[PDB]
């Protein structure tokens, strides 16, 4: 109802993520498909390294792997700057700053391609240290929850 | 340039440490719309997050199967 993007997104949108990533000179390339569905605020997505072995943890990348998604209810949705950007897009860059370690600064370009919503990206990683954390393979396979504060 | 006609975000994630303890990832983010045109430019509000991170019992390749659900609140309908 509220900006013609959102009408894409009434019921299941398939989905494709490209990342291309390079941390301290360990390449990697992840891909990944699945599906949105952003009256439910849902995503399920299965992501391959394809390059071999993931040099950092998956958790690490999680949040680089599409907001566009949410659940915007009621109205929240005179407020939904991500589906309203739809089917041209938009860009979301990043920097990560891990504490005590290194920093990922990312690009992604979020848009329709046809009727698949692709997230395709591209990842650079520095300073890490090589038995830190990230390089040293020291987080456990989990996630919490977290706010995701947005401002314009 | 990068948040022109778009948002910026802040949060910190918490990654959990094998054996205790938690690594702290601190983020910050901008987005600005590919195209020209008019987009909604939100008032102040926050993107609830929860993930899970699961493997395909009969996947062999290095994967990560990721759910999440994410609902968006913080706008409170009426006065204040």
């Given at each position: 109802?509220?900006?013609k ?5 009434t019921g ?6 490209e990342l ?9 390339s ?31 990348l ?19 700057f991500?589906?309203?950007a ?7 860059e ?12 990312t ?9 698949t919503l ?10 890490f ?10 987080l ?13 | ?5 778009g948002?910026?975000?802040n ?10 303890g938690?690594?702290?990832?601190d ?12 987009v ?8 609830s ?11 062999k390749?290095?994967?990560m199967?990721?759910?999440?659900f994410?609902?968006?609140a ?7």
């Open positions: 109802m509220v900006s993007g959102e009408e894409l997104f299941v949108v398939p989905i494709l993520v291309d990533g390079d941390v301290n000179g360990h390449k990697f992840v891909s990944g498909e699945g599906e949105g569905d952003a009256t439910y605020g849902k995503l399920t997505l299965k992501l391959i390294c394809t390059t071999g072995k993931l040099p950092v943890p998956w958790p690490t999680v949040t680089t792997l599409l907001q566009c998604f949410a659940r915007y209810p009621d109205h929240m949705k005179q407020h939904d991500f589906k309203s739809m089917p041209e897009g938009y860009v979301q990043r920097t990560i700053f891990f504490k005590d370690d290194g920093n990922y600064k690009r992604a370009e979020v848009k329709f391609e046809g009727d692709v997230n395709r990206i591209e990842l650079k990683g520095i300073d240290k090589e038995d830190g954390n990230i390089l040293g393979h020291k456990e396979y989990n996630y919490n929850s977290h706010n995701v504060y947005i401002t314009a | 340039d990068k948040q022109k006609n948002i910026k975000a949060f910190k994630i918490r990654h959990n440490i094998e054996d205790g938690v690594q702290l990832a983020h910050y983010q901008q987005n600005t719309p590919i195209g020209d045109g008019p909604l430019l939100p008032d102040n509000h926050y993107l997050y929860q993930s899970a991170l699961s493997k395909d019992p009969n996947e390749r290095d994967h199967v990721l759910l999440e994410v609902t968006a913080g706008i409170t309908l009426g006065m204040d």
